[PDB]
Amino acid sequence: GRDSLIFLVDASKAMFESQSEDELTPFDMSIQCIQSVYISKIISSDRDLLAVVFYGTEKDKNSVNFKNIYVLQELDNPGAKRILELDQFKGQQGQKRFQDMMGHGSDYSLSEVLWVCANLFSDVQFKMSHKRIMLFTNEDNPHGNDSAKASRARTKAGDLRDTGIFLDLMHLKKPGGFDISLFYRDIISIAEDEDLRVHFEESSKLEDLLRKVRAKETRKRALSRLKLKLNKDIVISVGIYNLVQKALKPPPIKLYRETNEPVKTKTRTFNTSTGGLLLPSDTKRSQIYGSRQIILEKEETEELKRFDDPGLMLMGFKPLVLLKKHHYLRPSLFVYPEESLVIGSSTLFSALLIKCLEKEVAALCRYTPRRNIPPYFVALVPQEEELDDQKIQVTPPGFQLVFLPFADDKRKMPFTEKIMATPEQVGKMKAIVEKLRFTYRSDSFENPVLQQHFRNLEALALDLMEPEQAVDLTLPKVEAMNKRLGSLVDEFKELVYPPDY
Amino acid sequence: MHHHHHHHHHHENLYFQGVRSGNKAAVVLCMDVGFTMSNSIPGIESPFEQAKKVITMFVQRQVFAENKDEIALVLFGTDGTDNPLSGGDQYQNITVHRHLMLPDFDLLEDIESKIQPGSQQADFLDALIVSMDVIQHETIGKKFEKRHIEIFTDLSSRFSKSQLDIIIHSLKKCDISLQFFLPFSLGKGITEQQKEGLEIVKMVMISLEGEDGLDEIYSFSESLRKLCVFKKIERHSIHWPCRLTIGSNLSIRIAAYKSILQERVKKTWTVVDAKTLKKEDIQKETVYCLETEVLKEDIIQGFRYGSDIVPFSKVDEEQMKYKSEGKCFSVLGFCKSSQVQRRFFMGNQVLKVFAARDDEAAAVALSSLIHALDDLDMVAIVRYAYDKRANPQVGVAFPHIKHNYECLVYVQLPFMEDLRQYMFSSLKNSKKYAPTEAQLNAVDALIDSMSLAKKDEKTDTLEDLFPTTKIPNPRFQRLFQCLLHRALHPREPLPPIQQHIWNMLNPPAEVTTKSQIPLSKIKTLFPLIEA
Amino acid sequence: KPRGLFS
DNA sequence: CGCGCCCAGCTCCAGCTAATAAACTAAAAAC
DNA sequence: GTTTTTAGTTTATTGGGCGCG
Numbered sequence A: 001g002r003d004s005l006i007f008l009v010d011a012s013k014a015m016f017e018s019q020s021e022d023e024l025t026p027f028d029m030s031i032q033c034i035q036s037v038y039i040s041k042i043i044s045s046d047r048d049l050l051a052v053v054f055y056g057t058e059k060d061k062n063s064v065n066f067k068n069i070y071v072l073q074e075l076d077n078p079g080a081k082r083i084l085e086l087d088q089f090k091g092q093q094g095q096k097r098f099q100d101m102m103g104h105g106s107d108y109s110l111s112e113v114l115w116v117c118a119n120l121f122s123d124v125q126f127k128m129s130h131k132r133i134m135l136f137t138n139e140d141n142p143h144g145n146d147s148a149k150a151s152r153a154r155t156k157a158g159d160l161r162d163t164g165i166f167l168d169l170m171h172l173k174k175p176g177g178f179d180i181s182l183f184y185r186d187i188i189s190i191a192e193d194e195d196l197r198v199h200f201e202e203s204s205k206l207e208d209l210l211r212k213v214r215a216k217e218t219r220k221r222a223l224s225r226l227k228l229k230l231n232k233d234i235v236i237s238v239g240i241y242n243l244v245q246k247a248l249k250p251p252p253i254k255l256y257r258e259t260n261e262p263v264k265t266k267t268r269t270f271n272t273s274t275g276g277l278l279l280p281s282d283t284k285r286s287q288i289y290g291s292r293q294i295i296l297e298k299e300e301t302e303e304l305k306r307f308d309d310p311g312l313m314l315m316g317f318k319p320l321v322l323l324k325k326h327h328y329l330r331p332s333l334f335v336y337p338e339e340s341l342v343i344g345s346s347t348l349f350s351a352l353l354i355k356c357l358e359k360e361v362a363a364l365c366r367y368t369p370r371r372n373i374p375p376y377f378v379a380l381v382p383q384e385e386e387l388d389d390q391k392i393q394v395t396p397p398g399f400q401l402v403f404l405p406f407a408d409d410k411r412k413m414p415f416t417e418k419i420m421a422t423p424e425q426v427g428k429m430k431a432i433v434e435k436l437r438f439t440y441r442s443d444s445f446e447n448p449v450l451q452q453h454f455r456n457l458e459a460l461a462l463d464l465m466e467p468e469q470a471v472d473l474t475l476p477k478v479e480a481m482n483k484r485l486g487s488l489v490d491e492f493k494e495l496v497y498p499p500d501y
Numbered sequence B: 001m002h003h004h005h006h007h008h009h010h011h012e013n014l015y016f017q018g019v020r021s022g023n024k025a026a027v028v029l030c031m032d033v034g035f036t037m038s039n040s041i042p043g044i045e046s047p048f049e050q051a052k053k054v055i056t057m058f059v060q061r062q063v064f065a066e067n068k069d070e071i072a073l074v075l076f077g078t079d080g081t082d083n084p085l086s087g088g089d090q091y092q093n094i095t096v097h098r099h100l101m102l103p104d105f106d107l108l109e110d111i112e113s114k115i116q117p118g119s120q121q122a123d124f125l126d127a128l129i130v131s132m133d134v135i136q137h138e139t140i141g142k143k144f145e146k147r148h149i150e151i152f153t154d155l156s157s158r159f160s161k162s163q164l165d166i167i168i169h170s171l172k173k174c175d176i177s178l179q180f181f182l183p184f185s186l187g188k189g190i191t192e193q194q195k196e197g198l199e200i201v202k203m204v205m206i207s208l209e210g211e212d213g214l215d216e217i218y219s220f221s222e223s224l225r226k227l228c229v230f231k232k233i234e235r236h237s238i239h240w241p242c243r244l245t246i247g248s249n250l251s252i253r254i255a256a257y258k259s260i261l262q263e264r265v266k267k268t269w270t271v272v273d274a275k276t277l278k279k280e281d282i283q284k285e286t287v288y289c290l291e292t293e294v295l296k297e298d299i300i301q302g303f304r305y306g307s308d309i310v311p312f313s314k315v316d317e318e319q320m321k322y323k324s325e326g327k328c329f330s331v332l333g334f335c336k337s338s339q340v341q342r343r344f345f346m347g348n349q350v351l352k353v354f355a356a357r358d359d360e361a362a363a364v365a366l367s368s369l370i371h372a373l374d375d376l377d378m379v380a381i382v383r384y385a386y387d388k389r390a391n392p393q394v395g396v397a398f399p400h401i402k403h404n405y406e407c408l409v410y411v412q413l414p415f416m417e418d419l420r421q422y423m424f425s426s427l428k429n430s431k432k433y434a435p436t437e438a439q440l441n442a443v444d445a446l447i448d449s450m451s452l453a454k455k456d457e458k459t460d461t462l463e464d465l466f467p468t469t470k471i472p473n474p475r476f477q478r479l480f481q482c483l484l485h486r487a488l489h490p491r492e493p494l495p496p497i498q499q500h501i502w503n504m505l506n507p508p509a510e511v512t513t514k515s516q517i518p519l520s521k522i523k524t525l526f527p528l529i530e531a
Numbered sequence C: 001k002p003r004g005l006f007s
Numbered sequence D: 001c002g003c004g005c006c007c008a009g010c011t012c013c014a015g016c017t018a019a020t021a022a023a024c025t026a027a028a029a030a031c
Numbered sequence E: 001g002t003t004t005t006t007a008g009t010t011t012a013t014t015g016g017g018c019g020c021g
Helices: A026-043 A080-087 A091-102 A110-122 A147-163 A206-217 A298-303 A345-359 A423-435 A448-461 A478-485 A488-496 B047-064 B105-113 B124-138 B164-173 B192-216 B220-227 B314-320 B360-375 B437-449 B474-488 B499-505 B509-525
Strands: A002-010 A049-055 A069-076 A128-137 A165-171 A224-229 A235-241 A253-256 A264-271 A283-289 A292-296 A311-319 A333-337 A361-368 A376-383 A393-395 A398-403 B025-032 B070-076 B094-101 B146-152 B176-182 B217-219 B240-246 B250-261 B270-273 B282-289 B299-305 B308-311 B328-336 B346-355 B378-385 B393-400 B407-412 B453-455 B462-464
Touching (some): A002 A026, A026 A049, A026 A091, A026 A128, A026 A206, A026 A448, A049 A080, A049 A110, A069 A080, A069 A110, A110 A128, A110 A165, A128 A206, A147 A165, A165 A206, A253 B308, A283 B474, A292 B474, A311 A376, A333 A345, A345 A361, A345 A376, A345 A398, A345 B437, A361 A398, A423 A478, A423 B360, A448 B299, A448 B308, A448 B314, A478 A488, A488 B360, B025 B047, B025 B124, B047 B070, B047 B105, B047 B146, B047 B176, B047 B220, B047 B474, B070 B105, B094 B124, B105 B474, B124 B146, B124 B164, B164 B176, B164 B192, B176 B192, B176 B220, B217 B220, B250 B360, B270 B282, B346 B360, B346 B393, B360 B378, B360 B393, B360 B407, B378 B407, B437 B509
Parallel strands (some): A002 A128, A224 A311, B025 B070, B146 B176, B176 B217, B240 B328
Antiparallel strands (some): A049 A069, A224 A235, A235 A333, A253 B299, A264 B282, A283 A292, A283 B270, A311 A361, A333 A398, A361 A376, A376 A398, B070 B094, B240 B250, B299 B308, B328 B378, B346 B407, B378 B393, B393 B407, B453 B462
């Protein structure tokens, strides 16, 4: 099926109160975070269903007419209009639009709120794989004054968890901090091997709230489940995952102008003379070498590609220092144990990981991703787990599957006489390097091409007179850099470039 | 890194010049098929059989290679005489078996069955003159960058030394290089005639190439060791000129080339009719339907924006399209190398960036950057764009440490949209899968036994016992073995993978014996069973 | 540097 | 300024040549 | 079945000087 995510936003008094005047209100932060997920799900052509519910509003909009619960958006595929609708509640002007449209600070009962959300999953005609409720609030004790409500909420929360609906808390900043143990500890869905250590800290920045949401929003999707053979007899099961996948400009789709409906495309193979459809058993494979035609069967062109059975065959252990940074061939993968196939895989995996780390060594393997494919040498680089200040998993624990090039993949460089700079010149450059120093983060740059493409689609889908212009984050901040460098540039030039250049 | 004699022309894109200019070579294989070539010691193969295998290996490699080099075959010591220099009673028992032309399977089949050992003996220097005549009379009109003559002999027979000066003069004037292939390795119970013959061969090589001339004398044995594998894929990277910019006032003229890429054979399978065995008899017709068919004169372009369907023509898309300045290499800033994890490396290439060709000022400027980054343990974060049309990239430019050459290495980094945020359970903090002390010790012993490295002369230098980056891609070797097998034996099924291929894909036999014992302990300590 | 037969 | 148009070097004369990005299809795997 | 991703292709273009709006 299609996965389901319901965004549940608190509309209490505290949600519109900023902790820092320069910082966004927990509500604005929530709206902006939701909009981002909606856009990201569009960028990646995701088939998941999204919903937007508010509680604590004076106005109510839901199927059983439960008071102070407003279903802004029912579960459905994201679009331009739904994103535009969320933009109406963005910023200080938006806060006014929301409060005058629906009201705020009214009394509610989380039990009724959860019923409305659970019902949205039931109304979906298509079958759903995952059912998830994401709660945005800076209130850590909603019914600390009403036992009757607190108890009903726990029972209902319990019922949802038993049904298979996940309840995740996106707790926002509150003066004196947000304490989960006071109430939500018994509401939120907790995985059996976490034991509350895996729970994220309170969000105070949109950036953090966004990553925390994005981290739970998408489920792991293995590229392949393979066997990691230490030998013929000792086989462990592993999952191969793609940590980085090139987000491409979605390909165009063929439509009829009058109907504006997508058109299906069938590609067939037929004999030119007879006109009849060609079976795969009616054609052969040819290659011409040394004035001769060499004919093979389709079955043989596959057989000549067969070496190892699919999986990872352990060759041995090579110290990490022997693996060159400049021997990059194609993006690296991630290896994690698959306990569901071979019982005992995780224990052996953990042992290998612990010892590879201690010895600063990599597990060299002969890799075969699927049947009838020649092998490639890969280095399984030990990777230790890393969590940031917010308790987000920056680096997952496992092995980095690093592809190693064959002699054919390497290219010899043209002859260049070695010319080296003096310490005086290197010194000037060092000073320049130190001036333009910055903190690199893998998520600092957005694809200008992708961003512009969807800004263009937004303008056309909403019939906007002008398309929104994306800010090219890849272009250097020239003016700032020049001022930051000052005379260092002219200094370097005098030491290197002759006036007659 | 190439030799200094290798011209930069081979890397620059010009109209049917440089990379585009067909690098063609003319090769004359001058084989001794004389009586003595068949005489051997009962323990080792005859020089005739050895030389025949070397020639087959050479021709086989050339058939599958992209080079387009032309090959001729001159035989000497044959019973008959077929020469354009024969006249009446000169250059006897020397046969031009094959004239200069592209090698083919008809040649290989001919080598295998038609070439028989001779009963006579010929003058090898006379055979060389006939070989030089082939190059002189057949390179006419054809464009050859190189001309080579490969002589395979045992140097057993008598010969005249009268033509030595005309031989050397013609080889030098016509820029023809020479190579000798003998049954023995150059320094032994060779005959006195062989010692005389060898001295002349040595003199010839020294006259032509100097002290290095001796290096062009090979044994058939060492030649079979180098030619047994198929020719690895070698292509010249196209020279990419541009300017590395730091702000808007500092520009550094640079030249980039592809260091690493997923190399592939260009030629692939052509789907042909099983009866006609022709390509044109097969045609693909892509039809459009809603079930109900649609004509091409009724389809427009569109894109999906979630649930929304947005019609957007290629014309409108062309104008609203993001527009950037092309052929741009710009520094955004510098950061600690630690902040750039190799696990984030993206793209299909690695670029080695050098200073612009013959520009000393640019070379010094770039060397300043390289060493500064290296001495600061930092890297550059740059914006890279191939041309005006190409989608811009954000990547890393890091220093490259070698004494023969200094360069920056470029590798693409990811965009926020490219990253996939998946959470995985902690394994260190696992109560279920934490290994015992005994289990950890078995793995510790396994890693030590299976070491693919060794320290030489206690110089704290690690010698890789299993390099893998020196190994040619087995896919190509396998494809070629099969293509050759089907060409020479059409009725026979495909052959199995050659042992040497498997031998190079496996770690040293030493490693395998050491592995089995700790591997046995691991099998008992770590229970493994399918669910 | 490979030449002739080996290049 | 940026666009399309049209010769480029090598053996009289038309055909050679090849890396490279970008668009494209077929096909395997996961779900 | 379904969708998602990739392996494996094919295809168009290349460089630069000159005249145009």
